[PDB]
A paper describes a structure:
[name] ([name]) is a [name] domain-containing protein which has been reported to be a histone demethylase and a ribosome protein 8 ([name]) hydroxylase. [name] ([name]) is a metazoan [name] domain-containing protein that is highly conserved throughout evolution and was initially identified as a dual-location intranuclear protein. Evidence from a recent study indicated that [name] hydroxylates ribosome protein 8 ([name]) and controls the biogenesis of the ribosome, which is consistent with the observation that [name] is a constitutive nucleolar component. Moreover, previous work demonstrated that [name] assembles as a tetramer and that the binding site of [name] to osterix is located on the surface formed by a hinge region (interface I) from neighbouring subunits in the tetramer.
We had already produced two mutant proteins, M1 and M2, lacking dimer interfaces I and II, and they exist as a monomer and a dimer, respectively. To further understand the role of interface II in the regulation of the activity of [name], we determined the structure of the mutant protein M2 lacking the interface. As predicted, the M2 protein forms a dimer with interface I. The overall structure of monomeric M2 protein is almost identical to wild-type [name], with an r.m.s.d. of 0.37 Å. Interestingly, when the dimer structure of the M2 protein was superimposed onto the dimer of [name] coupled in the same way, we found that one of the M2 molecules in the dimer moves outwards compared with the wild-type protein. Interface II, which was deleted in M2, pulls these two subunits towards the other two subunits to form an [name] tetramer. This tetramerization may further facilitate the shifting of the subunits when [name] binds to its substrate. In this context, we proposed that oligomerization of [name] might affect the motion of each subunit in the catalytic process and thus control the activity.
Residue numbers in the entry:
A (entry chain B): 179 to 525, 529 to 533, 537 to 626
B (entry chain A): 181 to 627
The structure:
Amino acid sequence: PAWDSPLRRVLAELNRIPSSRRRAARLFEWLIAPMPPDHFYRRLWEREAVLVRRQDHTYYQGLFSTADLDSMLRNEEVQFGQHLDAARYINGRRETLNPPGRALPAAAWSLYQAGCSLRLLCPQAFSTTVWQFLAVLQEQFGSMAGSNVYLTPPNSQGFAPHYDDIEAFVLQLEGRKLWRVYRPRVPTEELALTSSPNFSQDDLGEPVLQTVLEPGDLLYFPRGFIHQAECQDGVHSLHLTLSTYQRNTWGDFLEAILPLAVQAAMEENVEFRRGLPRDFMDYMGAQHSDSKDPRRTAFMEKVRVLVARLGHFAPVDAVADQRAKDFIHDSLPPVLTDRERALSVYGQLTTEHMLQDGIARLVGEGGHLFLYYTVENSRVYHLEEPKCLEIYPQQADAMELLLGSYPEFVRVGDLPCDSVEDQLSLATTLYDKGLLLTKMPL
Amino acid sequence: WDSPLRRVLAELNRIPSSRRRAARLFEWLIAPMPPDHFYRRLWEREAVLVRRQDHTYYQGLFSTADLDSMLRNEEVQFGQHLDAARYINGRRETLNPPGRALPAAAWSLYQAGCSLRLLCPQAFSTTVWQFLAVLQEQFGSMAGSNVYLTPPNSQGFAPHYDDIEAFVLQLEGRKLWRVYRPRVPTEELALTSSPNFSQDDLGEPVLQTVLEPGDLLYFPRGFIHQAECQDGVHSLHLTLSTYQRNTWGDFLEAILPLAVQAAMEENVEFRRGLPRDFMDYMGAQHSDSKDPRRTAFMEKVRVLVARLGHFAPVDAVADQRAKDFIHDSLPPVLTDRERALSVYGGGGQLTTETEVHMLQDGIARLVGEGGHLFLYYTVENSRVYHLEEPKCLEIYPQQADAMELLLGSYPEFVRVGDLPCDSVEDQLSLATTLYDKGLLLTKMPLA
Ligand code: NI
Ligand code: NI
């Protein structure tokens, strides 16, 4: 019997699936199993919270353990604040207790002992298993996948009730914790855009979901959904919560669209460049909130039709590209399979495909062309400034093909350039930067 | 001594609404055209020339002498208040010798061919002031002016197009004007001043004339123009300029981010996630894409942008622009009646029995900002653009219903004791603060 924890099983499996994309689907299919991904997104994602009773306390064995924390605190410069917070919720308040500087096992555990909950901002940096997990999942999210690990001692609550500004996937890892989740309390909170203030017990009402998680379980809920948790009994609780979809709304897309749309409208269409009525302020202003004038209301219309006309002028593509750019510079660097590694520079070449599917994007800025890529990003968010390189027009077509036709191999001498000077400097540059894998080791 | 201008100004002084005075002065300025026809058909559309057959028309406004007495009796200074300019053989060349333009240094440059341009004459001329201060009331946007003096057989400026509606009042001498239709759709009602052009680049003048004292030549932004003196006579024209940056676009530029803001706060569809993989079908790279779900994204966009209108704070922006107009506005020119009835001659011991209305119709805006109410006003502005910071005063919610009344019902007199106000201390306080601040007048001389 090849394997022991379905995590280790499925992880090994991904190393045997050749398409980074396909790997990405898979892992998520696993994450919410038995449930279909397709049914989840269509009806549940952003719609409702979700418990997955796994029945398998060993489901996640290998991802992260109390031990792995204990090592980290010993073997790495874990700093209170920057990497680790000590939290308490008692008598209805939260108290944070971060002794300045360095977070040593001694101190950490002595805080844990005093009822504090331990929260590890960024264990993707230190654990390479978590790193992989995220870096695979983020490719099917089209949005940064981040994660924190929470440890709560017996008979204590770490944090107050609140709603985040992200989609949360709680994975129970060890122990048992009593959760209470709530549906958005009012229209304006449904899919909220800002973390909420710390709420008290009167502030809320009756939960839609109230469960005790056990290792292997998964609990998911959309942003705006309030939630609190606690240890009871005598057992510790460990969980990793995965999070994404921060600032990834149509709204936030529109914000960028519109300013450029109006600029365009103004340069290209003259109606946008005409002068306002001269006496418009005789009927427009808070001061005339209530004018009977029937040109108060024509003005109002003209603003709407003109606003509607902007739909036509909006650089929809140009902004999609710019958001991707941000996802790239936002992304955790790729976890390679063994096959990929070996075929790549990480493991010469001649006129006889893409390293992975989600590591690079081509983006025209200022009549130029830049290929932005992930493969030199830290395992800390934005610790690296964005990384690109300049494509010259001659090679644009080729580069576009390479990205559009993964995972299909292409002969270097079938890359639609002008010359064979081009075809070689493109595959050469790409290959060295770790963007490109060969079918036979060079 | 007695010209049409002198006559219309003495007419304005007998017209009690400040809003009628403005209309009437414009009617005078573009006569014999009716303004009604001008603003519907020709404003922003066509160049317009008024052959007036009257040299005396603008007599009073400004003369060459008035420009001398300026130079010698006020610190007029090169760069800042006065520019010399020359166009010869193809190039403009600018020559502002640092320092204080006195007459010696001025006339020399005039003699050497330069055209003199006076940037801020309404500061020193009190007729130009009245002229602009009245006309801005009916343009609803800043009315600026410069005065251009040009010696014979010369040309001061290269051909350009401006970013403003321009009215040219020919005051002395003669000048050959050439006006040219916007050359391409993107230069029609253009957004910024053009680079100086070379006579090779320009098409066929849509209009060409010699202007004589008393004529008026209007033409919209975008329209290319240039002028030259010929014969042996000089030119002296004032150009009145307006409507800078006062477009439906500029209104929208402001609306939008507030509208998107409100839309997200106030409606869940905007707060929803993009989809997980849209950048598989939406990119510059995937410009040409086949995805079908693409043309769905595209529509979602257009349909949400459509929705955003129905979220736009159109009043609140109007109000902000009002507030900027107020700041840009020249300070008002009082009739002798306004002056006699207001804090310019007699002082605040009034009563519930005093009848009162606002001083003029265009000196104040009431604007709600940060849960507060402020009356912004022009009566303390300078006759120099933006020299003073925005002036205003706070209105407490127990007065706002009065204050709105007062502004709405100019020029109807309202007994003080009939002001919607909860108390009689409140009643008197508004009236008094408003009067002493010089925003109010009484029907009867206070003393
Ligand atoms: Ni939370
Ligand atoms: Ni000009």
